[PDB]
Design a binder for this molecule. Structure first.
Ligand SMILES: N[C@@H](CCC(=O)N[C@@H](CSCc1ccccc1I)C(=O)NCC(=O)O)C(=O)O
Ligand SMILES: N[C@@H](CCC(=O)N[C@@H](CSCc1ccccc1I)C(=O)NCC(=O)O)C(=O)O
Lengths: 217, 217
């Protein structure tokens, strides 16, 4: 059963929770609360590069969010069925992570800038990302971005869209395909559960998480 | 023959040049010089996400540096021989790209901060990265990080180390394994050529490149 090392909050680890959950995998979490716990982790050489996320799985201690995500995907049929697919999924995912980053950085912005930022996510989403996906979907009519099966691309996208909606609730207004897609995906049982109460899905970060992260790093 | 879209300079594209070169692949380049050329590129829908790098290869227009690198690696035996390997290479690479980023951002810093920054790269390299690799190498005695064959991890690492050395010439002083490794790698013929004159290898960015990039973005 995988073990997740990270502070108790979303940050960069959330994607990993999403994927694991979606793949139907149960896992554990070991929260960081202080510099010191981080040191111990570091000290025992558990963090290849001294950072988290780190996830212990299949006897390894993987680090680097993307690397971790690829591993899981590949262990769980979330990476396509061939190079072509794999290639698409990869790109989609990277592009998406670039959008998600805005959300990740958000809480650490200066309150003043926080607002300008939301506007920016809105614009990027609307203009740079949503349209690509909307068209993809519109173009093949399937419920998945790639290969008519769930992929890592769909989870990250789903994760991101929902996160955005938390700040800009109507962000999908003009993306009817994306709206439907979201809906369905969210009805996938593992996902449906993850979205339900008592999942390891984390809440949007608060003043505390923020404080804490600062305290550990 | 691949076609590289990017300004005429290193930026994020350099890794791609390195890999292609190393893999012995010849390619072309289409330089961006103005906002306008970027617009046209964008306008014709050639940039999946409206950004570069974009590389046209095997009939696709790939975007996202990492995604691009994985594609090439996978088309050229630079991604290991199995999941285990692939997994290592992946991590190494991501960690390395995190270091390289410092170099990428450098020129756009405020001159004052530029210096503090160099010191920082030095420290990170010394403390967080070099040691991992040095030990890996020291631990198996091979000339490659993984699988006793060239991998994407070795190229990125090589690229990075050399770039650092351009600013901190003795950065490898305490990494005798890394020094040797570097030397040998640099003697790989494709690499040896890339390093020689008349390669598509780019120079460290100047006031111009800097200016230009700003002008296009
Ligand atoms: N590229 C890596 C980077 C991971 C990383 O940056 N980890 C940091 C925390 S990022 C905190 C952060 C930073 C910027 C924005 C959001 C967030 I959350 C860490 O473990 N640092 C330990 C150390 O350096 O001692 C990844 O995606 O896994
Ligand atoms: N994660 C992507 C991002 C690529 C990217 O940021 N591309 C930018 C230039 S980065 C410029 C930059 C920015 C920060 C530091 C170094 C560098 I070079 C682009 O095409 N922008 C076009 C647009 O947005 O209109 C990658 O690695 O491919």
């Amino acid at each position: 059963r995988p073990k997740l090392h990270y502070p108790n909050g979303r940050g960069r680890m959330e994607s990993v929770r999403w994927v694991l959950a979606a793949a139907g995998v149960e896992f554990d979490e070991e929260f960081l609360e202080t510099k010191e716990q981080l040191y111990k982790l570091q000290d025992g050489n558990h963090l290849l590069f001294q950072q988290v996320p780190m996830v212990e799985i299949d006897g390894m201690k993987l680090v680097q969010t993307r690397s971790i995500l690829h591993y899981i995907a590949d262990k769980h049929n979330l990476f396509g069925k061939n190079l072509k697919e794999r290639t698409l999924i990869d790109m989609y995912v990277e592009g998406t992570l670039d959008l998600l980053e805005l959300l990740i950085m958000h809480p650490f912005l200066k309150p003043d800038d926080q607002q300008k930022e939301v506007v920016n996510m809105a614009q990027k989403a609307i203009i740079r990302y949503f349209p690509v996906f909307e068209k993809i979907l519109r173009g093949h009519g399937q419920s998945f971005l790639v290969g008519n099966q769930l992929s890592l691309a769909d989870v990250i996208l789903l994760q991101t869209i929902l996160a955005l909606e938390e700040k800009i609730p109507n962000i999908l207004s003009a993306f009817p395909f994306l709206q439907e897609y979201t809906v369905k995906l969210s009805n996938i049982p593992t996902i449906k559960r993850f979205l339900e109460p008592g999942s390891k899905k984390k809440p949007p970060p608060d003043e505390i998480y923020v404080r804490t992260v600062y305290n550990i790093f």
